[PDB]
């Protein structure tokens, strides 16, 4: 079981590296790692389990955040509920296309690897198309808009050594870009 002690902190070199592409099929260990990443998100979102293991609740986790420099992410976004929910373990995900239009969460973003809250808007693409493999090496293409688009971009950023606060304007952190869409969490 992964807990917070498996999550490496900002300043750790692995978070600034570019994660390595996976060979398919995954090793049994790689599959287990990816399953445990998802399980961490599940646990972090369970009130009782999170309290018991001191888990900070998350909707996304990238392998580099557990010091594994491999291009795997897990995303678990519960129903809001429009009836839409996102439960994905992705291998070698790639954004292949996206909207020009940007989106941002009005309170900025947070990160399991970052202890202090960082103020500032993180402008991302409002819509993205991702191609990836799943845990069994099968093909997935996702079309995402708004909040889930933001979450997946945050995760993929980790695979490229990019942290959310890299996107924050230093002079006017809370100024929206013109025509950017405010996304409600
Ligand atoms: C937008 C990218 C955020 C990714 C990070 C994890 N992370 O560090 C990944 O690299 C989170 O998931 C943040 N938590 C939530 O979003 N909590 C939350 C919100 C709605 C429902 C349930 C929830 F738990 C906290 C860790 C700040
Ligand atoms: Zn993060």
Alpha carbon distance 25, 132 (integer Å): 13
Computed from CA positions of residues 5, 11, 14, 17, in that sequence, does the dihedral angle turn out positive or negative? positive
Alpha carbon distance 38, 111 (integer Å): 16
- Number of domains within the chain: 1
Which residue's CA is minimally distant from atom 5 of ligand 1?
111
What is the number of other CB atoms lying within 10 angstroms of the CB of residue 8?
17
C-beta separation of 74 from 37 below 8 A: yes
Write the CB contacts of 15 (distance below 8 Å, at least 6 apart in sequence).
8, 64, 65, 113, 158, 161, 163
C-beta separation of 89 from 61 below 8 A: no
Helix, strand or coil, per DSSP, at residue 103: strand
* Backbone φ and ψ of 3, nearest 5°: -135, -170
154 annotated as ligand-binding: yes
H or E element, residue 130: strand 127-133
CB of 15 sitting under 6 A from ligand 1: no
C-beta separation of 42 from 35 below 8 A: no
Instruction: Determine the Cα angle at 146 with ends 35 and 129, to 5°.
Output: 65
Q: HSE (CB half, 13 Å, CA atoms) of 98?
A: 17
Computed from CA positions of residues 124, 62, 162, 20, in that sequence, does the dihedral angle turn out positive or negative? negative
Alpha carbon distance 148, 146 (integer Å): 6
Length of the chain: 185
In the reported structure, the alpha carbon of residue 112 is separated from the centroid of ligand 2 by a whole-number distance in angstroms of: 5
Report the DSSP beta bridge partners of residue 89.
74
CB of 37 sitting under 6 A from ligand 1: no
CB of 124 sitting under 6 A from ligand 1: no
Helix, strand or coil, per DSSP, at residue 160: coil
123 annotated as ligand-binding: no
Which residue's CA is minimally distant from atom 4 of ligand 1?
60
Report the DSSP beta bridge partners of residue 163.
none
Measured CA to CA in angstroms, residue 108 lies from 50, 103, 115, 149 at distances of: 23, 11, 15, 14
Residue in the structure block whose two tokens are 């929206």: 176
Domain with 117, as residue range(s), is 1-185
Q: Determined by which method?
A: X-ray
Q: Best mutation site among 59, 118, 151, 160 for ligand 1, i.e. most ligand atoms within 8 A of its Cβ? A: 59
Tokens of 155: 């995760």
Question: Which domain CATH number covers 39?
Answer: 3.90.45.10
Write the CB contacts of 165 (distance below 8 Å, at least 6 apart in sequence).
114, 118, 120, 122
Alpha carbon distance 147, 185 (integer Å): 7
C-beta separation of 73 from 158 below 8 A: yes
Beta strands in the chain (DSSP E): 60-62, 72-77, 86-98, 102-104, 124-125, 127-133, 139-145, 181-182
In the reported structure, the alpha carbon of residue 155 is separated from the centroid of ligand 2 by a whole-number distance in angstroms of: 6
CA 130 and chain centroid, separation:
13
Alpha carbon distance 6, 66 (integer Å): 5
C-beta separation of 74 from 63 below 8 A: no
What is the number of other CB atoms lying within 10 angstroms of the CB of residue 82?
6
Instruction: Determine the Cα angle at 19 with ends 33 and 147, to 5°.
Output: 80
Task: Specify the DSSP class assigned to residue 184.
Answer: P
Computed on alpha carbons and rounded to an integer, the radius of gyration of the chain in Å comes to: 16
Beta strands in 41-99 (DSSP E): 60-62, 72-77, 86-98
Tokens of 108: 């900025």
Report the DSSP beta bridge partners of residue 154.
none
């Amino acid at each position: 079981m992964l807990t917070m002690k498996d999550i490496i902190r900002d300043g750790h070199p692995t978070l600034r590296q570019k994660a390595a592409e996976l060979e398919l099929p995954l090793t049994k260990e790689e599959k287990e790692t990816l399953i445990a990443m998802r399980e961490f998100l599940v646990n972090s979102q369970d009130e009782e389990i999170a309290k018991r293991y001191g888990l900070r609740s998350g909707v996304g986790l990238a392998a580099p955040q557990i010091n594994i420099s491999k291009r795997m992410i897990a995303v678990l976004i519960p129903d809001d509920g429009s009836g839409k929910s996102y439960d994905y373990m992705l291998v070698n995900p790639k954004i292949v296309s996206h909207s020009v239009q940007e989106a941002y969460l009005p309170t900025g973003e947070g990160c399991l690897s970052v202890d202090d809250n960082v103020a500032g808007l993180v402008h991302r693409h409002n819509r993205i198309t991702i191609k990836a493999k799943d845990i069994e090496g099968n093909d997935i293409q996702l079309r995402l808009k708004g909040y889930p688009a933001i979450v997946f971009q945050h995760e993929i950023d980790h695979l490229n050594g990019v942290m959310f606060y890299d996107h924050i304007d230093k002079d006017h952190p809370l100024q929206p870009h013109t025509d950017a869409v405010e996304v409600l969490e």
